[PDB]
Every structure is written in C-alpha cells, then in structure tokens.
Symmetry: D2
Subunit: 291 residues, 4 copies
C-alpha cells in the first residue's frame, strides 16, 4: 500500500515555457512515464501496437507499458521531438520487443496512410491502435482564434484520428482494440480551450459510434479521459505559464497526475480478458470525478 | 390541456426519398412548423435575429416564433431551397416584421462573414444568433466514408458555426443570445452517424466554453438538443428510407417530434428574462431523456 | 438590452446564519423572486398547480410566475415558514387567481397524501405538480454524518417526491406536467454534500424513468437543474457561513442567481405547447455549463 | 492470443427460468461464468484485505475470485438463502491459498452493517478494499403498482446499506486503500420498469464522486463500476421480466449479455496500487451501449 497523494511532485513548479510540442526532457521536474516503476506481467504478449504521440507524455507511458507486457510498439511523433522519441525506442528495445519510429504530421492525410501501412508492415500486423497525438493551445478569447489556429486543432485531433483509424481497420483482426485519448475538457470545457474541448468531446462520440460499428465484428473501441497531467503539452502553451507553475494545486490531491499513473488504463482496455468493455470512456482525473 | 402523444402524426409514413438538403413541401406529411398554431405574446419585441437553416424544419419553426414574438428575422439556407424559404419570408412579414433572405453555403468562410455582415446591415444590428444549419448523411461503415463526406459534415457543422459565431460577436451587445442546435446523437452516437455525432458532441463543448468566455461580457450562449423530428434532413438521407418510414416508432410517444414543438425552447433561451441560463443544453426528445 | 451580469447583487454578502429551513425575509439582501419584475402573458390560463416549497426561493418564483400566467396555485411549505408563505398567497391573489396554503412535513407519508388530496379538492383538479422542496445540510466528513442526518435528507428529497407523485398521478389528466427540482450537485458532487448530491442525482433518474412510464399516457415529467441561487436553503446550513458570504463569487457572472431568473424554465416546461419536452433536465447555472 | 469477444459466451434465446429473488446462479440456464476456469492471477493485489458484498454470485463472485487469485484475502457478504452459491466462492478463495470469510446477513439492517465490517476486519487483520456490490432490483411497469415497501427495500439495500457499510469501514482503511461501488447503466438509461432501481444507481454515482473528494486527500480512492447487461440471478429473479430474460441483450452490438468473468478486470485495475490517479471515476463495461 502507498498513499497516492504524495507519491509524485506537487506545485509550485518553476517557470518553464517551451515552444510546442515541447520536450519532456526540458520540463522541471522531468515527467515520470513509468521508466523505473512499471513492471509487466505478460498481459499483451505478441500484440502489435501503434501509438501516435508516443514520444512523450501519456502516449510514452502507454508505449513503455505495452512493451513490458510483451507487445511490439510503433510510435508516431513530430520530427522536432526526435530526442524524446529515441528514448522511447530504446526503452521498447530494452524490454526485448521490436520498436518502430515513424515521425510525421498527422494533419497530412497521405502521411496518416503511410504511417499505418509502414507500422503494419514492420510489425507483421496490427491489433492495438492508440490515437493519442493532440494539439492543445490555450487562448482566452475567440477574437484571438484565427482560422489557422482552429483548423490546426481540428485537423490534428479529429481528421488525423479519422484517417489513421480508417486506414487501420482493414488490418485489425477480431480481438483487436482501438483506444482514443480524450480529456475531461470534453465536458469541463474551459473558456481558454474552445477548439480543444470541441475536439475532445467529438472524440468521445466518434469512439461510441465506431464501437457500435465494429463491436459486431469483434473489434473493441474505447477512450481514456485524463484530468490534468504533467506533460509537455501543458508547458508548451496548453495552459498559460502561470497555470503551469501552479498546475492542479486546487485538485483533491493538490498535484497533477504523472503519465505513469494512467498507463494501466490502456493495458486494461487492450487486454483480451476485458472483453465486454466497448464504447467506454474511462477517466483518470484524480478526484475531479468526470468520467 | 392536450394529450401530446396524439397531437401530431405517427409512423408508418409513406416511402419517400429526396436528394439533400430536401424540401419540406415534398414531405408526406408536410412538417408542422407552427404556421397555424404558434401565437406570439411580445417576448422578443424589437430583437434582431439570424437563423441559419431557417427555410425548413426546426430553424423555420424558430424563425416563425421569433417573428411572432416581435423580432426581425434573417434566415440562411441553400439556393435549391428557395421555394421553402419564400414561405418563411412571407410568414415573417405577415407577422408585421422585417425578413431578410440570405442563401449561401456556410462551408465557405467568406460567405459566413458575408452572411453575418448582411444580416446586421439589413436589420440595423444583431442580438440573437441561431446556429442551426447542419449536414447529416447516414453511412453504416467507416470503410465507405470518404474524406469528402467526413469533411462536408465537419465543415458545415463545426467550421461554419465557428466562422459565423466569430464574425457575429463584434455586433452582439450585452444582453444578446447565441443558441446552437445540437442533437441527442452527441451521446446516443449511432453506428450509422459517425461523423455527424462527432460534430454534435463538439457543438456542446463549443457552447460550454464560449459561454464561459462571453458570460462575463453579458452574452449568453446555449444549445438545444432535439431528439427525432420530422424534417427534410431525415428523408434526404439523414436516415435510410426504411427508418424514415418507421421514424421514432420505438420512442415513448411512438412518433417523432414536429418542428412546432421545439420552437418554445429557442424563444425561452433568447428571452431577456432567462438571465441565468448560460452554457446550458436543453433537450426536447419526447422521453428518451438525454439532455 | 440589459446586461444580465449586473442585474442582481454580487458578493460579498454579510455574515448571516439561520436555523433551517430559514426565512427569505431575513436574508441580507432579501432575494428577488420576481415580485416586481415577472410579467405574465396568458400562458397557463386555468391550470391547477401544486408547488412544494412554494413559500420561498425557487418555488416561490415559480408560484408567482404560474399565477401571473393565469394558473391557480397551491403551495406546500413547513409550518414555521408561514410568514414567507402568506406573502406568496397575497401575490397569487393579486394576480387574480386562487391561492391555497398547505403547510406540513413531506417526510410524513400520510401528510404527502393529504397534501395532494387537499390541493386537488381545493383547486377543483390538478394538472401541474412541482416537486421542489428539499433539505440540504453541508457536512465535511462522512464520519460526522449520523443516520438521522442521512435519513432526513433522503426522506425529504426522495421519499417525499415518490409519495406525493404517486398520490398525484390519478388526478393528473392527459396534458398534465410534473416538474422536479434537482441540482448541479447531481454531478458536481461536492465533498461537503454527500447525502444531498446522492438524492439530486436520484431525482434525475426518477424523472427519466417516470417520463418513460407516463409520457405514453400523455403526462410529461421533467427536471430543472439550478446552479447557485440566493435562497434560505443556503444560509440555513446548505453551505457553511464563509461560503455564503462569497456565494458564487468564482462563477462566470461572479454572482449567484436570484430565484426570479429561473421561473421561466418552470413556465416553459409546464406549457401545453412544449409538447416534446419529456424526461429532460434543463439547467440554469449561470455558465457552469452542467445541464 | 486474440479471441473474438462476440461469440466468446452464450447468446440468446435462453430457456424460461423464473426464480424467486435473490436467486441462485446454480439454477440459471446456462450457469454463469464467473471466471472459475479462465481467470489467471498475476500478483497484482498481494496481501490485500477485501470485503465484497453480494460476493456469492454474479459480478461480486467474479471480483472475489479475481481478488483471491491476485493475492488478496477475501470476505464475502450474501443472504443466508444463497449459502450454496457462497460455499463455492469460499472454496475458490481457499484454493488460491487465501483466507476466506463468509458473512451472511441483510444489509438493510444498520446494526448488521456495522457488525459485518467489524467481523470482516477482525478476521482478516485489517481491511483495504471495500466493494459495495449487493443490490435489490425488482422490475415494475408502473408507479401505481409500486408500494412504499417495494421502494423502501430498494433504497435501503442500495443506498442506506452502502452508506452504513462505508461509514463503518473508513476508520479501518489505511492510505492506499480502495472503495469500489457497483452502479449500472440504468443510472442514466433509466428504463420505465426500473423507477426505484435507477434512482438508487444514479445516487450511487454521486455518492462515489462526493466521497472521492472527501477521502482522496487522505489517500483513499473511491470509484464506481457501471455494468451493462450481465447474466446473473439478479435478472432472472425479477430484475427483468421473464420474456426479457429469455432474450436478454439480444439487441446489443454483440447480441449477447456479458458474463461476470468479463468485468472482474475492472475491479482489479481500480484497486491496484499503480492506478493511483483514478478517483471518483465511473468505469463502464456495457458491451458497446457506450454509456460510461
Ligand atoms: N496533460 C494533460 O493535462 C491532459 C489532460 C487531458 C487530456 N490529455 C490528452 O493527453 C494526450 C497525450 O498528450 P500528453 O498530455 O501526454 O502530452 P504530450 O505533449 O506528451 O503528447 C502529445 C503528443 O502529440 C503529438 N502530436 C501533436 N501534434 C502532432 C502532429 N501534428 N502530428 C503528429 N504528432 C503530433 C506529439 O508527438 C506529442 O508527443 C492528448 O490526446 C491530450 O489531449 C492531456
Ligand atoms: N430532424 C431530426 O431528427 C434532428 C434530430 C436532432 C438534431 N437535429 C438538428 O436540427 C437542426 C435543424 O435540422 P432539421 O432537422 O430542422 O432539418 P432541415 O433540413 O429542415 O434543416 C437543416 C438546414 O440546414 C441548412 N444547411 C445544410 N447545409 C448547409 C450549408 N452547407 N450551408 C448553409 N445551410 C446549410 C439547410 O438550409 C437546411 O434547411 C440541425 O442542426 C440538426 O443537426 C435534427
Ligand atoms: N439555492 C441553491 O443554490 C440551489 C442550488 C441547486 C438546487 N437547488 C434546489 O432548489 C430547490 C428549492 O430550494 P431553494 O434553494 O429555493 O431554497 P428554499 O429554502 O427557499 O426552498 C426549499 C423549501 O423546501 C421546503 N421543505 C424543506 N423540507 C421540507 C419538508 N420536510 N416538508 C415540507 N417542505 C419542506 C421548505 O418549504 C423550503 O422553503 C431545492 O430542490 C434545491 O435542491 C437550490
Ligand atoms: N446483471 C446485470 O445485468 C446488472 C446490470 C447493471 C448493474 N448490475 C449491478 O451488479 C451488481 C451485482 O449484482 P449481479 O448482477 O451480479 O447479481 P447477483 O444476484 O449475483 O448479485 C447481487 C447480490 O446482492 C446481494 N444482496 C441483495 N440484497 C441483499 C441484502 N438485503 N443484504 C445483503 N446482500 C444482498 C445478494 O447476495 C446477491 O448475490 C449490483 O450492484 C447490480 O446493480 C447488474
Ligand atoms: Mg512530445
Ligand atoms: Mg431546408
Ligand atoms: Mg422556505
Ligand atoms: Mg446471489
Ligand atoms: Na466512465
Ligand atoms: Na439539459
């Protein structure tokens, strides 16, 4: 037994702006993605996985967990994040599994198609897809939101997911899983996250509808809804700098989550024994009590 | 007192297919938008309103009610719907008010700006905005959903709303109202409405976030969530023809709604007396009991 | 047009505590239930209504509005609230309608039955029922919550509603309306409102289930979900005194609602024209954006 | 490897099979699968000390088996008439090498709730996983037929019982402990024939969320699980009418109800010490209804 409250760092944190998408290695403190704590138990042996945004944050924690549970792992990421991605590749390989690094921008439809084709070719198949990449850039007013800002968030968080998922489904055998990362913002819908929250609510409806389409074919589609986590998405403008300094201070634990803490949700949803979880949204928000 | 169950038509309806967006005048029965039944009582006197998709369906019922409550009304619609729109223009003027007809495709960002500008110019201002136009085209499988189909739905239902709303805010005085039409599909998320349900959940988060931005400025932003209603959106491919024949037969009333029935929600949300309703989603789904 | 933000008082409010259920006339400032501002428009002429907790707060605002819309009104309240209740009786009569005053404790099943029977007898019928009375007593820890405390909340807010509603249904003709007051606490579920939040979530499910039972029989059942409002429920222990002093200071308007502002929801849900609103939860929370 | 979940378990139609409540799993046709043969532990709850109400049958039985195989000692509550189901669970717990405790009694009685927790904690040498899973569910088509006795039995079992047990348990729970409450998709599906039941299941979610905010700061996590339709005696003893039971979940995306075996992984995942930022959550497993 461990008290979860003081298991991880609490605010205040140092001032630390990065340009998006940021690097985990440059945060203060660096996030804990489970590098030391996550121990596998053979729960996903021989599975074949693609995790978008697997270089850092929640995607990285999921990639590490999958590899240690016996799964081979391809990760997508943006080229600017190469130094974070190389760490994850090294962690996958140290677990004795195959790692594939597939950099590119999922706003580009033809890249989405190439990404899935090359992941499946490299792995000799595909049977866990995690749509986790996201753009998040806070703005206090719609007056400041250009079409370029709105479009970048929607193209990353909705179109990219649509294109990748559509390309993936012909590869996925019965027994496979799709997992989409959404956010408590889907319904908390902060004033400063107008476009982001719009997409995160959309992801949940997409998940539920696609689960009804694919469930009869033996493919399960689910979503994970984090509350506030210590990731480069936040310190590179997902929240303003002063919010980052005091991130989640007012929450029940008085601290943000660390990515390590949410990896178990992804493993549980993908595992073959969790066979009646389909169309679900599983939250991990530290007591906000949203999903 | 009237028993609502028996107040309006019940299925089965005759087999009837139209190409989208369809005409209300070609439905059997023609929808009841309140042309004979809605009596105004001075609840929106002198208001200045823009209703997208005001030619037919729910938007037409809202436009008729607004005019009879003393508001001037501009309606958007697509050019092929001119014969429906002309009826709404005549109903607005018959109530003694000013009508403005503004056909154009809201997937076009520049038309969205033109629509708002011309509505405000003609009416001498703008203080009720109703984002109600939508695309809905049922498809049973993501495998048959093209990027063109997905994009048409997202550009109509999310980008059009964003562009129109952003262009309208500089016109809106303290005390104004924005109302966005969403759907029970936001959470019912049927297998055959993958892109549509995505957008309708998005609209709710957009409403909630914008309400937190604009509430402090004195502008209220709310959503209306219809269940199934008898409109040309459904018989022009929003549902497959045999579902249209049997539309809402399984509901608690055993019948779909008629547009007339939901107009009162739009009047109540816009009324100045409803001054602490902001960020809300008000349902009218006949007992499905969703919002 | 008037800015709704500045329409009503903002905190801080004087330190003030009353023994429950409290009196509206002893609050500082006295609440606005629409005594001067609510304008009837002939929307409920000849209806026959029973409002529990109609002496003060939201129920008082609804009772004034119903009378001004042309309905006869019976109000329930606790005997110690006679001084608040007689003001409401006077306002109903000033609107030209019949008032009935029916004090008693709805935790008493036999009283619940007498209440409904005497209301219908005195009015000559019954066709709007508003279950609005509630108990709310904040407590920081379950360790301090006696069975007596938990039972008082559940018996008032769940059993009382059940008994009154069961007794009323044989009187209610097709076309009648039942409205249940719930709370954003149903899902906000504050730490200090453990028993209360339980009951308010229960009320929503009760509303939805009963709407599916009675909808087919021509009786609509709906719920209203207020956010924070300035009523004696709060300064008599519903929130601790320092919260009352700063009540809703952190909300988008920076003020709580006044009961006057939510009356239009009760009128709209009761009106015959709102005929496809059944099983709904309509929020009025000032921009929290919950229901 | 990969298995198609659609046809992993039996589909309707099932034979007519009314039981008087609370019913016995051994008298269902077919007998439910609680994971007796299939669930393999992996040392995820070693040394934990657990109390599961309604652990004789159904979802609670599946949780009990999984907890024991993951290394936890397990006390179960149930009603005396279910002794024959409970004795099987006791044997499954012991065969995993754990301590089992059988604590029959009716949780509508406040005094029994207090003694249930005291006796569970005493027998196990502590308590650090509480699963509030017992429930009453009796379908009725109209409120006119619903007596105060019927309403009260559902509310006393599903809300008051949970309240009394939870309150008595909290002084025993150390930091790192878990409380898990079983709710239902009926919390928001709110069928016409489950008026009192749906009321309580929505109530359970608000109770979970509020208590998570109370206890989270002290290191105790409070969460809920939201099943869709599962093959259990709660349904065939009147939770649904007989014709619905015959065709249970035929119209769902898989065309079949869940078997309790399938939901046990949710209870293990919520309780595990590594799942340390899950608090106040409602995790659904409804086979594609897509509710929680
Ligand atoms: N951190 C939080 O507080 C929080 C809260 C709720 C939800 N979430 C969700 O967490 C998920 C993972 O993000 P995170 O918080 O772990 O942060 P993160 O920055 O570590 O991960 C986001 C990833 O998105 C990828 N990405 C962004 N734009 C891309 C593009 N155009 N092409 C390809 N890849 C792109 C990047 O590789 C990046 O690593 C996101 O879906 C986000 O919505 C996070
Ligand atoms: N009818 C239902 O069962 C139902 C159910 C839930 C929600 N809704 C919502 O109701 C709203 C109104 O639809 P309705 O059912 O009254 O149908 P409708 O067909 O009468 O109205 C939809 C309108 O959208 C407009 N429109 C569509 N694409 C457009 C474009 N590219 N540019 C400009 N205008 C465009 C058309 O003018 C059309 O009249 C929509 O937002 C829809 O999502 C309808
Ligand atoms: N004021 C808020 O901030 C707030 C917030 C959310 C929801 N609500 C809801 O608003 C509704 C009305 O409360 P209000 O805020 O207007 O406060 P209020 O105190 O003015 O009204 C509550 C009324 O409940 C009645 N009542 C209480 N116990 C009773 C009993 N045993 N028997 C008979 N009558 C009894 C009393 O007559 C009292 O006037 C309640 O259902 C409450 O849950 C209020
Ligand atoms: N089976 C489904 O379709 C379904 C669907 C949604 C939710 N649920 C939930 O699942 C949970 C477990 O039930 P189940 O479906 O496994 O059925 P089940 O019949 O196997 O378990 C319910 C148990 O409740 C216990 N119980 C009932 N009344 C009691 C009392 N007064 N005192 C003590 N114990 C009492 C009995 O021991 C019984 O075994 C319940 O909380 C129920 O709400 C079930
Ligand atoms: Mg990164
Ligand atoms: Mg049209
Ligand atoms: Mg009072
Ligand atoms: Mg049993
Ligand atoms: Na959930
Ligand atoms: Na609502």
């Amino acid at each position: 037994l461990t008290n979860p409250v003081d298991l991880y760092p609490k605010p205040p944190f140092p001032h630390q702006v990065q340009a998006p998408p940021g690097l985990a290695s440059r945060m203060q403190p660096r996030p804990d993605h489970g590098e030391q704590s996550y121990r596998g138990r053979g729960r996903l042996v021989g599975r074949k996985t693609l995790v978008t945004g697997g270089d850092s944050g929640i995607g990285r924690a999921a990639a590490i967990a999958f590899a240690r549970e016996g799964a081979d792992v391809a990760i997508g990421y943006l080229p600017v994040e190469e130094s974070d991605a190389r760490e994850v590749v090294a962690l996958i390989r140290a677990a004795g599994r195959q790692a594939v690094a597939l950099p590119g921008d999922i706003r580009d439809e033809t890249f989405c198609q190439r990404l899935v084709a090359r992941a499946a070719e490299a792995l000799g198949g595909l049977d866990i897809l995690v749509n986790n990449a996201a753009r998040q850039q806070a703005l206090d007013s719609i007056g400041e939101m250009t079409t370029e800002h709105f479009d970048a968030t929607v193209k990353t968080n909705l179109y990219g997911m649509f294109w990748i998922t559509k390309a993936a489904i012909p590869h996925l055998p019965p027994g496979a899983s799709i997992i989409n990362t959404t956010s408590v913002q889907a319904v908390r819908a902060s004033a400063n996250l107008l476009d982001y929250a719009t997409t995160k609510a959309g992801i949940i409806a997409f998940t539920r509808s696609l689960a009804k389409q694919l469930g009869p074919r033996g493919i399960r589609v689910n979503a994970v809804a984090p509350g506030p986590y210590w990731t480069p998405l936040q310190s590179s403008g997902g929240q303003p700098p002063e919010t980052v300094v005091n991130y989640a201070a007012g929450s029940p634990y008085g601290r943000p989550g660390q990515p390590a803490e949410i990896a178990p949700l992804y493993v549980a949803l993908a595992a073959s024994e969790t066979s009646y979880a389909n169309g679900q949204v599983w939250g991990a928000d530290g007591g906000l009590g949203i999903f």
